[PDB]
Amino acid sequence: EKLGDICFSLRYVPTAGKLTVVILEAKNLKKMDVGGLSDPFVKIHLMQNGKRLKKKKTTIKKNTLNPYYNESFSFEVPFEQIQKVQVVVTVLDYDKIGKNDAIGKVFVGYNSTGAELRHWSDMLANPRRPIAQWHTLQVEEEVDAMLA
Ligand SMILES: [Ca+2]
Ligand SMILES: [Ca+2]
Ligand SMILES: [Cl-]
């Protein structure tokens, strides 16, 4: 059972120092509820050098492995700093009681690789243009080890 995939857009406006992330949809999420599906929501963190700088989150979708969000988030990152940050996208299962367990996550930006680096590079190369791309979710343990 794969963890799932997430589709989001990135847009960077260098003059304004405006970094926009639109969480579009996730698919094929791992089932997190016993005898059910999942109740997924998404967190978006701006990081640098192992520090959480800013945190944003989507609404919760109930009883789905294939949630649509279409929710936009913006961060202030000046052009002198944009190459030095990470944007971390985490899908979690909401439970009314207990910690919300991460399904999986990915990050783009400084120290990203593969399709994550490709997405970030495309954003940087195309100022003011939103670029949507799919990403495979990865186990929290591994991504956090990269980010710490
Ligand atoms: Ca659960
Ligand atoms: Ca749940
Ligand atoms: Cl909600």
Ligand SMILES: [Cl-]
């Ligand atoms: Cl708990």
Ligand SMILES: [Cl-]
């Ligand atoms: Cl939480």
Ligand SMILES: [Cl-]
């Ligand atoms: Cl894609």
